[PDB]
Amino acid sequence: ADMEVIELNKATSGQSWEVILKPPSFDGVPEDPSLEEIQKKLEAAEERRKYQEAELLKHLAEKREHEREVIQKAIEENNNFIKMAKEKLAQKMESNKENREAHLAAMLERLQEKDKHAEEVRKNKELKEEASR
Amino acid sequence: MRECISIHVGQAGVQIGNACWELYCLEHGIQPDGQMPSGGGDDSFNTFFSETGAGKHVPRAVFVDLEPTVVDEVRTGTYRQLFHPEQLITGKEDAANNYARGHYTIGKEIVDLVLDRIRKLADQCTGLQGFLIFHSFGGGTGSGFTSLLMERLSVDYGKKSKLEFAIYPAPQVSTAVVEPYNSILTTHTTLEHSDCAFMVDNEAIYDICRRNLDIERPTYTNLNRLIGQIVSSITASLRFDGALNVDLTEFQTNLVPYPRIHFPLVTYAPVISAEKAYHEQLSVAEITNACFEPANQMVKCDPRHGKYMACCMLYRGDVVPKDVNAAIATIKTKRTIQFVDWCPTGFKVGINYQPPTVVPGGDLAKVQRAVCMLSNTTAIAEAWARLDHKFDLMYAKRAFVHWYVGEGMEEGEFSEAREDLAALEKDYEEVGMD
Amino acid sequence: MRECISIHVGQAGVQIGNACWELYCLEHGIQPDGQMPSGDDSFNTFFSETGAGKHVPRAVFVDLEPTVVDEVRTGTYRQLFHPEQLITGKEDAANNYARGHYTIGKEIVDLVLDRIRKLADQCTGLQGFLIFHSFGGGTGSGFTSLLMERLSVDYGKKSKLEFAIYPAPQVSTAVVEPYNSILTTHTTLEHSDCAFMVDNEAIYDICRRNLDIERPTYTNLNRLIGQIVSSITASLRFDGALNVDLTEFQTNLVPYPRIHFPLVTYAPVISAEKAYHEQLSVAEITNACFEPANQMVKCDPRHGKYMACCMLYRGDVVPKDVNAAIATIKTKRTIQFVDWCPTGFKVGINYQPPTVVPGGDLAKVQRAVCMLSNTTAIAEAWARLDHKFDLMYAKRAFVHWYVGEGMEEGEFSEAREDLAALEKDYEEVGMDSG
Amino acid sequence: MREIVHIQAGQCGNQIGAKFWEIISDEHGIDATGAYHGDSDLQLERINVYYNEASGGKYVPRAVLVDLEPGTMDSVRSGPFGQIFRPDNFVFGQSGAGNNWAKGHYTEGAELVDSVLDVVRKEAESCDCLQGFQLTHSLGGGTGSGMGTLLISKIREEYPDRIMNTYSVVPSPKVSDTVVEPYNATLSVHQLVENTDETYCIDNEALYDICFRTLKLTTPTYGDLNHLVSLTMSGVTTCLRFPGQLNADLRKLAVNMVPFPRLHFFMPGFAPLTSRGSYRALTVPELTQQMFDAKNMMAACDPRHGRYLTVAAIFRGRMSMKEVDEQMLNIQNKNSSYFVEWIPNNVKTAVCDIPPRGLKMSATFIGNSTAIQELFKRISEQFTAMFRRKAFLHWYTGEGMDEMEFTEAESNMNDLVSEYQQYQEATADE
Amino acid sequence: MREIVHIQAGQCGNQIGAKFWEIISDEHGIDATGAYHGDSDLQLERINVYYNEASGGKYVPRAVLVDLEPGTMDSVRSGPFGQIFRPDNFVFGQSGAGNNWAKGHYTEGAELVDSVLDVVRKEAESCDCLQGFQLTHSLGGGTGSGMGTLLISKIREEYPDRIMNTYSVVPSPKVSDTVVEPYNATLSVHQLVENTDETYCIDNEALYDICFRTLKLTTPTYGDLNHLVSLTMSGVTTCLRFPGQLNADLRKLAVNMVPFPRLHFFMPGFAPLTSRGSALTVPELTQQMFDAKNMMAACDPRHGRYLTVAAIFRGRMSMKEVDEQMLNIQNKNSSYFVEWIPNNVKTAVCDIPPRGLKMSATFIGNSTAIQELFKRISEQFTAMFRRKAFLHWYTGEGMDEMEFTEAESNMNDLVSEYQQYQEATAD
Ligand SMILES: Nc1nc2c(ncn2[C@@H]2O[C@H](COP(=O)(O)CP(=O)(O)OP(=O)(O)O)[C@@H](O)[C@H]2O)c(=O)[nH]1
Ligand SMILES: Nc1nc2c(ncn2[C@@H]2O[C@H](COP(=O)(O)CP(=O)(O)OP(=O)(O)O)[C@@H](O)[C@H]2O)c(=O)[nH]1
Ligand SMILES: Nc1nc2c(ncn2[C@@H]2O[C@H](COP(=O)(O)OP(=O)(O)OP(=O)(O)O)[C@@H](O)[C@H]2O)c(=O)[nH]1
Ligand SMILES: Nc1nc2c(ncn2[C@@H]2O[C@H](COP(=O)(O)OP(=O)(O)OP(=O)(O)O)[C@@H](O)[C@H]2O)c(=O)[nH]1
Ligand SMILES: [Mg+2]
Ligand SMILES: [Mg+2]
Ligand SMILES: [Mg+2]
Ligand SMILES: [Mg+2]
């Protein structure tokens, strides 16, 4: 049966009041930002975002440099292959030339020695003949 | 004059704004083109609508989104002549469900433009009360852009009230896995800048649409029309010459005993299907009893597990004080209704004579009398606990955190936001101890 | 566009070139005078075009004696080649590698390179060189080695693939063919990318068994060799369902630089008589590739392991029928692959059926296939050759003929030690992994 | 978040890409000449995500067609919707990559890559709001794999703030084109782990197995394999092309699907499984069941062998949204042991009224499952069997590559497997 | 490798040389005036290997005719085909070497050698691509043996890179009674071992034995012996004279036949054996390869092993049958071939049979059994040299005894080298 009704306000399209069933056990109701602060925090976040985008691009730049180093390495290997094939072949053709000329000279010197022996035979025949009877 | 500026942020905020402003137009007799053949009777509608040199009435509102699709529907739809193009503001790319993207990356490029528009609306006010901000906790814009805007609004309008209508995330209609992160992050940054926040859990409204309106799979159009009904009930005494919650400061006075515990529970009745066969009108006793039923709440939580620190009954329509007092007397007789020891057990009651209005062709039946209860109960801490637990499960593994860190946020901000919500949970416990 | 330069060296290389270029002309509709009436323009990889619309082979024919090339110069196709691409000296290499490489070859090598340089100047996308030669002749062995070395200096690592004739006693012209084969293999090993060996005894026996020819001549052997060469180059000269270029042959067939000798198998080889041959399916011609009687080199693949198989189909062949045939081949326990090869099948399909020379020994077939397989069984052919080398070299028999031309005995030891390492390389490569 | 720029590289990339353009053109009512002849506004609402509007009401795919060889280009131009493509968007070389990742990535591919970037830059600069890039390619060859990954890193450098999405075809010995596929695939996975935001793993092993075991095709062809891929790609892109709330753009999809940056490899699922000659039913409970069926996965992994970190489920056709919601809740509750407990509400569902071409009802599942580690282990075992013996290595080192790149790619892929295993074993009670 | 320059020295050399020119002229369709009246294009395809084309379509043998005696020239000019030879190519002295190798090599022969080189240089320099030289001579007299070997070393000095080939007639006590034939033959073998690339050993002992035992000629003459030589020479030069794959030139033949530089002495074989007044099957022809009765060197091929063999079949016969029979003859007789020279038997088939026959077989064998021919000469040499008999015939011409000991040692070393390879195993 206990209910304290208290009229609050009355107006053109409304009416208000407070209904109190029981008063409180404990008497009494007990038991700034700045543009600069905001801006400083937003700009610090922007710098972290830009720093990580820069790190991503720095790594992509490192991949582009590596790509250039593999193209260069393949070019250098092809050039060293050419250089080695060229001097191996020049060495082989020159050794072969020295050898073939040496074999030809040795066999011609053998035939030339036969000619020296032949004139020496001719010499003895001549003194056997003539200087007789 | 007591003008209020409405700020609709992101998809949820903008789509709820479409529903609210459509209902206000119907309630004040304003046509979609801004014309008014002056129904209502009084000129209090001027708190929410300014007037142009051609006799048109224009909402004191700003619609903002980081993407243009949703606001483009407002720019080209039924109410395109109701708003001037300068109050419909959009960027090109959204916040991709990421608070850090909305707060630190994309929001930063449109915030000055939004503040400039708000300043031009404030210049047309002789007695600016403050702001009503509509947004979701879950979206990247609703979370990140709203908190960024709240901070600047505190710098530019220190002694002005800021009231929120916030959408609490629900898996049935959820758009992102990271919604618990966005919710805890935005609550942390907004806590000290907001004066009073009316949370609406999509699951509670979704279940009310299924149970009370017989809608199998409710859409955002169904949910928002019901949200509009609740928002209209809460703003009715600012837009009509009412007697309770006559100014925005009165909301903090009547519902908020401590600055951090500013999340009142909303309950609404009756919610009846338009397609229902000619039913008899519900009495003041029946709609009052429905106020004390968990199934009619805007947030899923158990008031039996908590204590009330303030209670406001906003009746609307064919309602007489004698019938209200008789209804409240029976409820105290059969129910406990435990109040904290430092607050009196009782209610602040308001009757707004203007009838409840429904959108023609909508899902809601036109009723002779309705009631909206706003109660600050410690039981709402259950919604924070559910959200905090989901945050903890993911954050223990640092799941999805790289998305926020990649936008310039630090891990410490996640710890700070979570520690602040742990303090909020302890505050509800301490405040409701005796 | 994707040009291939053909180099035909010595009697075997030149006579096989006569058969190949005659067949390419028949396959592309090029008349003996280089004219082609009024499409698939892939034949441009093997034929250049003059201002008068005449199509000219991208080829050089070289021999140290003029007799064999004189037949080209005065025959049916004398207008097809410009006289400057048919190069001959006066005196041959007398079945001596040393005369081909040094004494006689060094006199004509600059002229041959000058002509190849003029052909390379007409290439916008030179793929490399196709070198046709025997292992046994003094020119085929010695001049080819010298040319291979000079091509590595002028073109670096530009692809050099061979079609090499492995010696057979039935048609052998010299006792010293094992010496010429070992010396050329040693010199050429590091300069060649891939060598397709054709054993004359295997082609001889295929002509006797499959074509009913009592005593096969070079005309019989060469027409069949031309068919195999045309199959290997059909993917470069036509654009079929699946193509394989010079680079793809190398990558798929050569797992290690020295292990570059794929075995060639061809099917079907049917006599122009019979008539009741009943058209062989894709499965039947695929199965025939793993039958020893259809191989171009005498060796037993059951005694070895496959490391790569390239299938070159031509004619009425559909990819579905090829995959079904290769799937049944993968289930054959008797067809073993090295354990370090998860899949060793490269397939190429061309729509153009195997064209046969009018009045030849081969029947017109609807579909044919040429398999190029890298098998460790091919080491049997090297072992056979190495043993004959050892029998003669232990006594220094015939060595004075090479020494008299400027060669040293140390070159015989080095060449033989290199082939001994190659034999051990086939043994190591066919071993299972730990 | 409007425009997507599509790139197709190599034979496989251009074959599945032409098939993607042919299916979505039919769904959007666009004929072979680029003319719109549909009867629904949902078909044109988001047409600009994939098509540019040219003079005279014609729609032209925002697609760049790439190869190091011209034959593929000719076959696409000659194909059913070949004339729809912008002629200047066909960028091709003459040499080919010789099935070698190193030629595609460092030599021949590097020579053609700037011609490709000039064409994708013209498409990108024309965008009002570029979402990012979509690449179709195989990982087993030289062009799609080597040049495709080279393109990704070059695009990452010029558009670091855009989403990079791939449809990556994983090789299988069951339907193989080259002997060096495990090398080309491992070197590409290494690139994808570091430079893509979302990768759909389209496994040829899984496609071959669906055709052989389920469709009873004794000898499946690329046409049979590509029919499953085209339905899958139509399914996974549904939310990018039609009006809807969930995963409506490439970044919202990535935020919902990718909890850890390296774990961005998706296991696509599709129901019903059909052949090009096709049953006549499939109910909502039947469609939801296929989410855990290894037989319905386009990656050769068993979803019951691991746990789903996240799932996007797309239902298409005339079906009850209420029934789909009930069945999706039941499939999660009954299979709680196959979802990580520390990512709450990790399954998001979408329903679209327009079914894929040729079907009345369908389901597509985009799964981020720890079972995808089985696909990487399979590639790794094939890689090690070759690498242990250094087989075919001279073709890569001959292009200037070092052996260290192989060991690094192998380590990164094994670390990825070890990461998936770590989250598979992780409990909520740390 | 086109032109061959032929030289014939002394009586024997000019008698077998005139016979060679008469047989190959008939085979190539060339009459006694040098006119071509053949029927086949195979006859003229390689006509330039042995003949020059003179004014008016006539063919003239690239042959130089040499003798220290001027009667041999007159008899060749008077013989069949005498008018075919270039008149300025007849180079003759007046003295005669008196069956003395020293007179031929050092005295009278040295006085005539420059007139011969004048004529062979003109022939050789006129060649487009000179293969080398072919010499017919005997080893038992003075001109053919002494002057013939002097010519070889002089031509070798001027043309060191050309092939030097000889048809060397070995003496026998059965046909000639000249006592010093073992000396002239040993001094010539010494020269041939060091300066020729290929030498066909035409043994008068073997020729006499075929005529006496097989042809039943009680008293054979040089005409009877030379008929076997002309058929043999036509047979061994078949591959130089007609289009073909195998041993088509003097260097390719040497590379296939000569495994060791000194072992270049060939044992020729021929079937069928005919007289000047008298067709075998393929198996019958192949069997004669191991028949001592068919050898033109008095050695039994079954007494040694073949290092290498060239088998030439002529006439209309099956190449398939020849291939089958040649494989059977080496499989059944594997012990008579050295195992360490694989595929050492090369076969050739020519459609044109020799003059007077329908089918023939010629075998060019490099057999270790040839050491029996050298041992026979060596025993005859030692029987004389041991007593220094007739030495003043050679020392009177300026020679030293040391040249004899050296020639003897070199010939015994040659025998010892054939024996070494005969006994050698593959192991
Ligand atoms: N699902 C499909 N897989 C394909 C198709 N075509 C090829 N592939 C697979 O792709 C892989 C390599 O084939 P590609 O033709 O794409 C190689 P690509 O052109 O990119 O480079 P190159 O090696 O330079 O030719 C291998 O796993 C094949 O089985 C296709 O149409 N569908
Ligand atoms: N088979 C032949 N052997 C012959 C012929 N003429 C001679 N001889 C043999 O040659 C040897 C004697 O040689 P020659 O008569 O040629 C002596 P040549 O003219 O060369 O020198 P000189 O008479 O000493 O001046 C001796 O063994 C004879 O039996 C012949 O026509 N055929
Ligand atoms: N009641 C209601 N909730 C909505 C509506 N639209 C979205 N939501 C909810 O809001 C959350 C998602 O936030 P949104 O407002 O769509 O996102 P946003 O603010 O536009 O942010 P971004 O799109 O990320 O830039 C989810 O919980 C949705 O269920 C709406 O019209 N009504
Ligand atoms: N298949 C085939 N093999 C041949 C042909 N001609 C020769 N040979 C073989 O090649 C080898 C001999 O080499 P050739 O090519 O004739 O000699 P060459 O290269 O001309 O060298 P030289 O004549 O010594 O300067 C033997 O094994 C012959 O059987 C031919 O037309 N076809
Ligand atoms: Mg939004
Ligand atoms: Mg030759
Ligand atoms: Mg390709
Ligand atoms: Mg005399």
Residue numbers in the entry:
A (entry chain E): 4 to 34, 44 to 145
B (entry chain A): 1 to 38, 43 to 438
C (entry chain C): 1 to 38, 45 to 440
D (entry chain B): 1 to 278, 281 to 432
E (entry chain D): 1 to 278, 283 to 431
Quote the study on this structure:
GTP tubulin is known to assume a curved conformation in solution and a straight conformation when integrated in the MT lattice. Here, we modified our original method for the preparation of human α1β3 tubulin to purify Drosophila α1β1 tubulin. We first determined the crystal structure of Drosophila WT tubulin within T2R, a complex composed of two tubulin heterodimers and one stathmin-like domain of the RB3 protein.
